[PDB]
Amino acid sequence: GIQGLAKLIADVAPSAIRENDIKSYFGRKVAIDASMSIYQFLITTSHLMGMFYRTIRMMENGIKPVYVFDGKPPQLKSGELAKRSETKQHNDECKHLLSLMGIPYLDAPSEAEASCAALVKAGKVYAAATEDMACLTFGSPVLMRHLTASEAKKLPIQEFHLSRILQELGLNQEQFVDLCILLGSDYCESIRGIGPKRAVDLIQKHKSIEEIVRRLDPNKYPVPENWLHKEAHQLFLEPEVLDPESVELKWSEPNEEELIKFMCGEKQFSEERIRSGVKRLSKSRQGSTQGRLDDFFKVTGSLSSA
Amino acid sequence: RWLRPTPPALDPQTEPLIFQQLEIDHYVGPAQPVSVPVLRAFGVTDEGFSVCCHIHGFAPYFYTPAPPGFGPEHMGDLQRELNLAISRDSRGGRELTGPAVLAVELCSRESMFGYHGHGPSPFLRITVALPRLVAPARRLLEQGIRVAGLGTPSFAPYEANVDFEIRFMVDTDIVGCNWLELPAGKYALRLKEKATQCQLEADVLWSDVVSHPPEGPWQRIAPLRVLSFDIECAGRKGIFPEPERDPVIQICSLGLRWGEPEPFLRLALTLRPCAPILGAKVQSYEKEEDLLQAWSTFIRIMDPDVITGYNIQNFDLPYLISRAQTLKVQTFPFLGRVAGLCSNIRDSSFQSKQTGRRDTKVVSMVGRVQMDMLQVLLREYKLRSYTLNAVSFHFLGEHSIITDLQNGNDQTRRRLAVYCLKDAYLPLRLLERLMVLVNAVEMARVTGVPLSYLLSRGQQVKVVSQLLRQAMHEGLLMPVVKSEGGEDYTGATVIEPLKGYYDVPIATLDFSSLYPSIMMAHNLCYTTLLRPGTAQKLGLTEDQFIRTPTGDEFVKTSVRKGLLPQILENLLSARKRAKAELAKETDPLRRQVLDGRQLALKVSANSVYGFTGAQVGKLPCLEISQSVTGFGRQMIEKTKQLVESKYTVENGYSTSAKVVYGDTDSVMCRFGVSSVAEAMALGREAADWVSGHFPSPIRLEFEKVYFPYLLISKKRYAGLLFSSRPDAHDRMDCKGLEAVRRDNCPLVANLVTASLRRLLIDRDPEGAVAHAQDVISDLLCNRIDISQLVITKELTRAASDYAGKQAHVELAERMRKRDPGSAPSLGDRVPYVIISAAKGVAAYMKSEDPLFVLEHSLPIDTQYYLEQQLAKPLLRIFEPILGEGRAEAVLLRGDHTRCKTVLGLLAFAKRRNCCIGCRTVLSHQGAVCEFCQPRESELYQKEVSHLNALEERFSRLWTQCQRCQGSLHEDVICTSRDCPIFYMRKKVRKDLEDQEQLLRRFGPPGPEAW
Amino acid sequence: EEAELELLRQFDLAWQYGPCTGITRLQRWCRAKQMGLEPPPEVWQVLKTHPGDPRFQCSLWHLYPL
DNA sequence: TTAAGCAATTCGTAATCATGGTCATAG
DNA sequence: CTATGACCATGATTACGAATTGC
Ligand SMILES: Cc1cn([C@H]2C[C@H](O)[C@@H](COP(=O)(O)OP(=O)(O)OP(=O)(O)O)O2)c(=O)[nH]c1=O
C-alpha cells in the first residue's frame, strides 16, 4: 500500500482514526482482501485454519464478512521489476472452506482492494478490511485494520474515515491521490525530494504533482526516472473493479458434515475443536442491529462555540 | 613522574619479540606497502616496556551459497559477479558497493542447523575491502539487484556475518590477554616512523605472528601499571556542582605495578599553597589551567595500562573535559596513546532481564583500559546500598563545608588533601582484595573475548565466540534465523509440599550440573537435530536415534558428535578445577571469593543452555529447550517414585519414608529416624543407589540433613544445617523468607532472624514471645532508631512506573527546593520512610527522604509499621507450631503491650506542668502532687537511674566518632547517612536535655556559690 | 560589612586558638585570652559594635547537624 | 545496532458491590 | 405529625501490575 501514510494521518488528522473494539462492529458487512488475508495467516494448513477461526470470530461479534480475491494484476512497481530481468492451489483451497461455511466470495477483475473500495462506496458493505491504506487512496470511505488479527494479539480494530482525512488535509480525493503517490505508492517510484509531512504541504498549495514538479526544479530535488506519476494517479481513481450492484452477497448456513468431512479428515486436525467451531459459527447467524440517527435525519452541520 | 625502563639493544634480524597484549584496535590507513584496514595491538614485555604492533594485510569476508544455475560454476560469471553492471539503472546496485575487491572463491562447506548428512556442498566466499562495506552489500545483494547475466538469481542468504576483531581472533587463535611472538627477521621497527607514543613500535604482516596458548609457563601475568584518582570541586550552598561554574580544586592519584604489595607513586595536585604530607609529593598552582595541564602531562609521562576509580565514568572524566572546554585550554583532551587524537563524550545504554537497564556515558581512550569499580559491583553483586561507605563497611569495616576548608588556611587544605588521598586509595584495596582482575583475565582466557567486552556486553558474544571457535574444526557455517516472535514453552515442575514444622531429620539429595549434563549425555545439538522427514524413508530407529518427551528425534552418538557437548565439557572442567583449588583455603573471605569464581563459571555453563531458548537473540532452537525441561521433569518424578518406593517397612528397613518436598533439582526426603548419624548413613546410601539408573555424567548426591525443619510455602523454608556429625552444626538456612529480601525494613528482618534463632536453636517460645513483645513495645513507646525504619526500592524504566502510582517514584520525581541537580536517576535505589498523616487512601502521599525528616523533624506512623510491615510475617512464622490460639497469643501479647503509647499552631504552647506520680495538671511548678507527696523519696529514686543510663550512652557514642575519625584534638565532621552512629548521636543530646530538666523540678542538693 | 564577615571566618579556623565548633565566638575569644595565647584586638572590636546578631555571634557551622 | 531462560509469592491502588443514616415528602 | 423508599456516604471483594527471589 501507501508508505508512512498511517503515521502521517495519526500525526496530522487523528480525528479520522478511531480505536474501537471488535464488538462495536456488530451488524456490519465488511469487504476483506482474501489475498493479503490468506497471506497473513501463512506468515501448511494455516491458509485455512486462520481462514477458519478468524472468520468465526468475525461472525461471533456480528460482523458479516465477504472475502475478496484478486484477478489479473496491473502495472505495479516492484511487480513488473523482474520482467526487467527476463500457487492458487492453497488459494482456492480457501474459496472452498468459505462457501462450505456459508460465506460469500468475489473474483475481483484485478486488484481486490480497489474492488473492496468499489463496494464500500456503493453501500453494499460497511468498510473494507485490509492492512494496506491503499483502499483509502482508491476512494473507500471506511477502512478497518486488524480485523483479521489473532484472537491473542489483543489489538483493537483501527478505523479510518476518508471523508475526514480529505477534510483536514483540505484536498479532494484526487488531490489526496497525488499525496499518496509522493508518500510512497507501490505502483510507481516516489520522489526522493519531499518528505512525509513535506509532501502534504506542497500538495496543499499545488493541487497536483504536475504543478509541484514545474515549481521546485533544481538538481537538489530531481524527479524520478520513468515516473508514471500519471498512470498511477489514474488507477487510484478509476480502477478495474466488478460493479457493486452486479451481485448480492448472502451468508448461508454452515454445512457441518460436508465441511468437517473436508477438514479434520481430508486435512487432518483436532476434531473436537473444528466441531465446536462449526457449532459456534452456526450460532452467530446475524449481526446488523440498532440504527443511527443519520439513518433518518440529514446532518445539518456543526455549531462551534464562540 | 617515574618513567618506564629504557629498551636497550633489540635487533630485529636476530632477536624475536615476546609480549602480552591488552587492547586491539581497527584503523583505516594510508602508507600501504608497495589492504587499507590495518590492525593495532598494544602490550607489555616480560620486563616492562610498552609495545605497539601494526598488523597488515587483512580484510573482512563472508559466505553465501552458489545458486544452482550456469552462473556460479562458470568462471566468466564468477568474474562477472566481481565485475560491475555499467547500465544507468544499476546506480542503486553498483555504486554503494561499487568497485570493491569482493572477489570470487569456491569452497565446499555445510550449514549448521539440523542434520541432513555427512556430505558438503559448494559455497561462495566473498571478500570485501572495508569492514564498513558489508552493511550496504547486505542491503544490495538480498533486497538489491542480483540480475547480473543470470548468475545469481535472488535470493541466496548471507551466512557468518560477524565482527571484524572477533573474526581476526577466531582466524589466528588469539584470545584475550595472550602471549604473542614475532619471530626473527619478520618484523621491522623503523619501518614505522613514530605516530604513537610507545617505546617499541613494530610493523608486521598478519601471517608472521605466533600465539602461545596460556598453559604451563605461559600462564603468567606481566607487570602492568594501574592508576587510581579522585577529584574535588567547590560548590555553592544547596546547588550540586555544574561544570560551567564550579572549579576543580584538587586531583589526587595513586599508582602501582601489579604484583608488588604496596604502591610506588602517590601524588596530590592542589590549587592553593598547601602543607607537606609525609609519603607523597605536593605541588601547588595559582590557576586551574596549570593544574589541568600538569595532570595531562603526568598522565602522558607515567603512561599507565589500567585506569580505575569509583564513579569516574559518570562524574569525573566528563567534568574534567567540560571544565577544560570552558577555560580555553587546547592541549588537555589528548589523553590517549595515539599522538594526534582528542577524546569525546558519548552516551550508551545497556538492558537485560538479568541486571536491568543502565545508562552510562563513555569517554574515548585508545590503548588504555578503564575499570570503574562501581559498574563491577552493580553487575556482579546484589546489595542494599551501593555507596562507597556502604560497600567499604560491607567488605572492610568503616560539599558546602569543603568550600570553606579551601577558602581558609593551608592546614585546612592539608586536611582536605589527606581526605582526598584516602578516597583515591580505597578502590585499589577493593580491586586487589576481591580478586577482580585475576578473574577477569581468567574469564577472557577461557571464553576468548577481549578484556573490554567484559564491562560493556552480556553473555551472548562469549557463546557466539566459543561456537565459532569450535565450528572451524569440522567445516560448518552458521545461518541467520530471526523471528518475531515465537511462543513460550513449559518450564520446571515443583512438587506439592506437606507444609509445617518438622522435628525429625529430612535429608536432601540433588543432581549436580543438571541441564548441561542432560545436554551432554543424550547428544543434543543444533548440528544433530533430526527434522521430522529426513528419518524417512530410512527405518533404523534402534541405536541410531532417540525420542524426547516433547516429541523430537535426535541422532545417537555413533553417527555424530555435537558442538554444545564439547563447549559445555570444557566449561565444566574449568569449574571443577576452580572447586578443587577452593577445597584448600582456610580464610573465610577468600573462601567466598573462590566461591564467586566458581559461581561465575556455573552461570556461564547455564547461559549456554539459555542461549537456545531466547527468541530475541541470534540463533534460537526452542525444540532443544523443550527437550531439556521434559527430561528434567521426567527424572525428578523418577527420583521421587524410586525413593519413596524402595525403603519401606516390608523391605526389611525401619520406616517407609515419605517425600515432603522437591523443586526441579532437589528432593527432601523424610526418613523417620531422629539420629543424625543414621539419617546421614541411609541418605548417602540412597543418593549412591539412585544414581545408578542413568547415563553419565548424571549423578545424584547427598548434600545435607536439616534438623529441625520449617516449611511455609513454595520457595519459602528454613532449617538448621549439618555437614558432618562431629561437626555438630554449621548455621541456619533461610530460603526465600523475610530476612534475605531487600524490600522491607531492617527492623523486620532482624526480628525474623532473632525469632528463628530463639525458636530453632534454644527451642524456647516464651523468650520468643517476650522478644517480639519488647520490639513492639519499644516501637510504640518511640525509642526505635530511624536506621531500622528505612525502606529502599529500585527506580526502573519510567513508563512501567508511569502505569501505576508508587511511593519511591513519587519521592524521586518530586524534586527539592535546595537541589534540582542531585536526584535519583534510572537504575538506582531510592530510600524513604513513611510519616503519619490522615490521607489513608494513599501510602504514596506519606513518603519522605530520611535526611529531610532528619532536618525537619516529622513524626512517624507507628500504626503503619505495626500492622503493615511487622504483623503479617510474624503470623506466617508463628502459626504452624501451634493453632489459631497462637494468632490470638501474639495479638494478645500485643494487647497487653498496645495499651502503652508515647505521644504552625505548635509554637503557641502553654507548657502545662504535670504531677510526676499520677499525671494531674495543676498550677505551680512543684513536681509532686498533694495526694502523692509522701512517696517522693521513691519517686526521686525512680528516674535518677534513668538519667544515670542516659549519661552512660552519651559518652560511649561521642568518643567513638573520635576513633573513627582518627584525631583526638579536632572537630568531627561526618554526616554519613549509612552510619548508624550519625543521628543516634543526635537524639541522646535531646533525651539528656529533657531528663536533666525534669530533675530540676526537685530542688538543688546543695549550694554552689560558697 | 562583607569585610568583617571574612575576619571572623578567618578567626574561626586558626588552629592556635582552639577546636571550636560547639560554643560561641566571644567565649572562645575570652578562653584564649585567659591562657593568653595571642587573641588579636580586632575580632573583639566587631563583637562590641553589634547587638545579638546570629551571623556575627555564632560559629561557622552552628547549623549543620554535626 | 543491542539484549541468557521460566516459576512463584507478596503487596498496594483503583474499581466493583453491599449496606446503613439521613431526609423528604405524601398520608 | 408520621411511613416509605430514594439518596448519600462508608466499608468489603476482586483484579492486575510491580518487585524480587528460587531453580
Ligand atoms: C541458577 C540457575 C539454574 N538453572 C537451571 C540449570 C540447572 O541445571 C538447574 C539446577 O539449578 P542449580 O542447582 O542452581 O545449578 P546446577 O545444578 O546446575 O549446579 P550445582 O548443583 O553444582 O549448584 O536449574 C538455569 O537454567 N539458570 C540459572 O541461573
Ligand code: SF4
Ligand atoms: S557518625 Fe561517627 S561513628 Fe558514624 S560514620 Fe560518622 S564518624 Fe564514624
Ligand SMILES: [Zn+2]
Ligand atoms: Zn499526684
